């Protein structure tokens, strides 16, 4: 009904620094820095005092209000990622064929290399995204951890991993081989 | 087990088939269930040898008297079937 003004609050801890011209957002903290463009959104920003940033929408509808809330959520994710970080643990399973997971540096591009998935000679290559670090978890069988500050890049890379090793033309009730996300969380 | 299960092996360059059957109770036989009538029809029809396992022991949750009772109950099927008994350890 054209709400005259709607507001959302964004809390900033002490170590974090937030810089916002028109709708570009830069967030700097211990773990690094992050940037995001929100010029598609048509909202208004303002600051109260070094710990509280308000986002406002004037004379808008349901979709505009939803955009306000999701903007708040995105900035909160940026702050959490620059402060603590995001860590996704994935486990790869097999019944007969041991899946061999390695890393290769090809033209300085950091590809993840999967071999012998369900007994195939094809070599599945997944490009690692910038701001993502892979390590093979020690003392835990067949687990790989993706760490970073961009939840988007981390989760999308994990999704690429679990999608590239999909099973084709076989009953999944029987064939359980694959790579699956075991855990999501912080560092 | 509620069904018949089959296995194969090769002995003396010949394929044999072993059949595990779920169970029989002593059951005066004008009332019995479709799980035991599988066992009965299998023992009656096929041209096999037949191995009765006794398990001479307090285990099994079943007494030796009941075991020999079942054997004596179903021995009419055994009239042409090449029977052996195995004790699996007064």
């Amino acid at each position: 009904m054209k709400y005259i003004q709607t507001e959302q609050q964004i809390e900033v801890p002490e170590g974090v620094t937030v810089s916002i011209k028109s709708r570009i957002v830069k967030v700097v903290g211990p773990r690094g820095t992050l940037t995001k463009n929100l010029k598609h959104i048509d909202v208004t920003f303002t600051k109260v005092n070094n710990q509280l940033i308000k986002v406002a929408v004037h004379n808008g509808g349901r979709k505009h209000v939803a955009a306000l809330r999701t903007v708040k959520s995105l900035v909160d994710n940026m702050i959490t990622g620059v402060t603590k970080g995001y860590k996704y643990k994935m486990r790869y399973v097999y019944a007969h064929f041991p899946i061999n997971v390695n890393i290769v540096e090809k033209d300085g591009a950091k590809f993840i290399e999967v071999r012998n998935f369900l007994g195939d000679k094809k070599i599945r290559n997944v490009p690692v995204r910038d701001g993502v670090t892979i390590e093979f978890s020690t003392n835990v069988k067949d687990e790989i951890v993706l760490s970073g500050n961009s939840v988007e890049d981390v989760s999308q890379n994990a999704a690429d991993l679990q999608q590239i090793c999909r099973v084709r033309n076989k009953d999944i009730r029987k064939f359980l081989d694959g790579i699956y996300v075991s855990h999501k969380g912080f560092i | 087990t509620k069904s018949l299960y089959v296995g194969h092996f090769d002995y003396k360059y010949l394929r044999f088939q072993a059949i595990d059957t779920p169970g029989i109770l002593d059951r005066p036989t004008e009332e019995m269930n479709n799980i035991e009538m599988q066992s009965i029809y299998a023992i009656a029809h096929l041209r096999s040898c037949v191995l009765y396992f006794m398990d001479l022991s307090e285990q099994c949750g079943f007494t030796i008297e009941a075991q020999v009772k079942l054997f004596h109950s179903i021995k009419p099927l055994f009239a042409n079937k090449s029977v052996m008994v195995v004790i699996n350890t007064d």
Partner: protein
């Protein structure tokens, strides 16, 4: 220099005391002060100094000044 530098984006706001310039009508270039707010589009203005009658008016007929 590690404090937040969020912009402001100043705006001329519709508020009681906000003075406005009437760009079309019988007044046609006179000043008046918003005294009350009827809705998003209508307000009540009053200029006795320049001589405009107290009235309800749409905001398209006026233009807000930075003065209040």
């Amino acid at each position: 220099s590690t404090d937040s530098i969020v912009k402001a984006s100043n705006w001329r706001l519709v508020e009681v005391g906000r003075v406005v310039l009437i760009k079309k009508g019988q007044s046609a270039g006179k000043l008046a002060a918003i005294v009350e707010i009827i809705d998003q589009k209508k307000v009540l203005i009053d200029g006795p100094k320049a001589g405009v009658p107290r009235q309800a008016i749409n905001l398209g007929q006026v233009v807000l000044t930075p003065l209040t």
